[PDB]
Each structure stands twice: as C-alpha cells, then as structure tokens.
Amino acid sequence: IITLVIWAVIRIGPNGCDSMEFHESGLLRFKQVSDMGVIHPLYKSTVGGRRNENLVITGNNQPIVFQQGTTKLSVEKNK
Amino acid sequence: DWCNVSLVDTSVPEPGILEHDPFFCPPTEATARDFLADALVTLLV
Ligand SMILES: *[C@@H]1O[C@H](CO)[C@@H](O[C@@H]2O[C@H](CO)[C@@H](O)[C@H](O)[C@H]2NC(C)=O)[C@H](O)[C@H]1NC(C)=O
Ligand SMILES: *[C@@H]1O[C@H](CO)[C@@H](O)[C@H](O)[C@H]1NC(C)=O
Numbered sequence: 125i126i127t128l129v130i131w132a133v134i135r136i137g138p139n140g141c142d143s144m145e146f147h148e149s150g151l152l153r154f155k156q157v158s159d160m161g162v163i164h165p166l167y168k169s170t171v172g173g174r175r176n177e178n179l180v181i182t183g184n185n186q187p188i189v190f191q192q193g194t195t196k197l198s199v200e201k202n203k
Numbered sequence: 204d205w206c207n208v209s210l211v212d213t214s215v216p217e218p219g220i221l222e223h224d225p226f227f228c229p230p231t232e233a234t235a236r237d238f239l240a241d242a243l244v245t246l247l248v
Contacts, residue, residue, distance in 0.1 A: 138246075139238045151231060174230035 134141040144154045165171070173179045181188065183199075190197035 138242050145236075145238075147231075147236070153231065170226075170228065172228035177230070 134143065142155060144152065147153055185201070187198055187200040189199075
C-alpha cells in the first residue's frame with residue numbers, strides 16, 4: 125500500500141514520474157513548468173540558456189526591475 | 204610695421220576591436236535516451 129502511495133504521489137508511470145529524470149552524466153533535466161519561488165544562487169551559478177537559443181525573460185503583465193542599492197533598471201509595460 | 208614682421212619655415216611636427224570571453228555555458232549535449240527496454244526487462248522478470 126505505501127509503495128503504491130509512493131508510486132502515485134510522485135505520479136510515476138512505466139517511463140517514470142512526470143516531473144524529471146536524472147541524466148547519467150549528472151544533468152538534472154526537468155519535464156514541465158517550474159515554480160521556483162525565491163532563488164538564491166550561492167556558488168558558481170551563471171543563469172544561461174541553450175545553444176543557438178534566446179533567453180526570453182518576460183514578465184507576464186508584471187514589471188522587471190534590475191535593482192542594486194539605489195540604482196534601478198525598471199522595464200514596465202509602457203516605460 | 205617692421206616690429207611685427209613674422210618669418211616661418213618648414214619644421215618636423217609629428218605627433219578598434221571588440222571582444223569579451225566568458226567561462227562556459229554549454230547546453231544539453233547528446234539529447235537522446237529511452238526508459239522502455241530496461242523497464243521491459245525489469246517488468247518481464
Ligand atoms: C501605463 O499604462 C497604465 C494603464 O493605463 C497607466 O496607469 C494609468 O493610466 C491611465 C490611462 O492611461 C491614467 O489616466 C492614469 O493616470 C495612470 N495611472 C498611473 C498611476 O500612472 C500608466 O500611467 C502608464 N504608464 C506610462 C509611463 O505611461
Ligand atoms: C604687434 O601688434 C600688437 C597689436 O597692435 C602689439 O600689441 C605688439 O606690441 C606688436 N608687436 C611689436 C613687436 O611691436
């Protein structure tokens with residue numbers, strides 16, 4: 125019973141759970157959308173992107189503010 | 204006026220790239236795998 129509960133809560137199928145997989149080189153890939161909340165990169169964490177691809181940092185009806193102390197770079201919907 | 208007479212002769216008066224290197228940003232190389240044949244083995248035993 126508890127093994128079925130473990131199988132079902134992570135929603136594991138014959139291929140595996142519909143969340144992620146561990147690529148054998150260590151590359152933690154994911155499979156769908158992610159809501160990471162706050163993020164605090166500590167050590168050697170350069171937010172990049174895939175080759176021949178464009179980072180698309182969009183705020184869905186929300187501003188984007190690059191802040192540092194007083195300095196602000198605010199990209200709102202119309203300013 | 205002879206006082207402001209000026210003489211001049213010849214003399215010898217003789218007085219772009221862009222590049223930045225980051226460290227790394229490689230993507231998911233060798234993007235292919237499957238989880239059926241091993242699943243078939245471990246569910247066929
Ligand atoms: C961006 O658009 C919003 C929504 O229209 C603006 O907010 C209000 O817009 C109305 C009509 O455009 C104005 O009458 C109000 O005075 C605005 N309120 C405020 C608090 O600004 C907003 O002003 C726009 N931003 C820019 C820079 O134009
Ligand atoms: C040359 O002319 C200026 C302007 O009038 C004058 O002040 C100056 O004394 C002149 N120089 C000489 C050597 O006279």
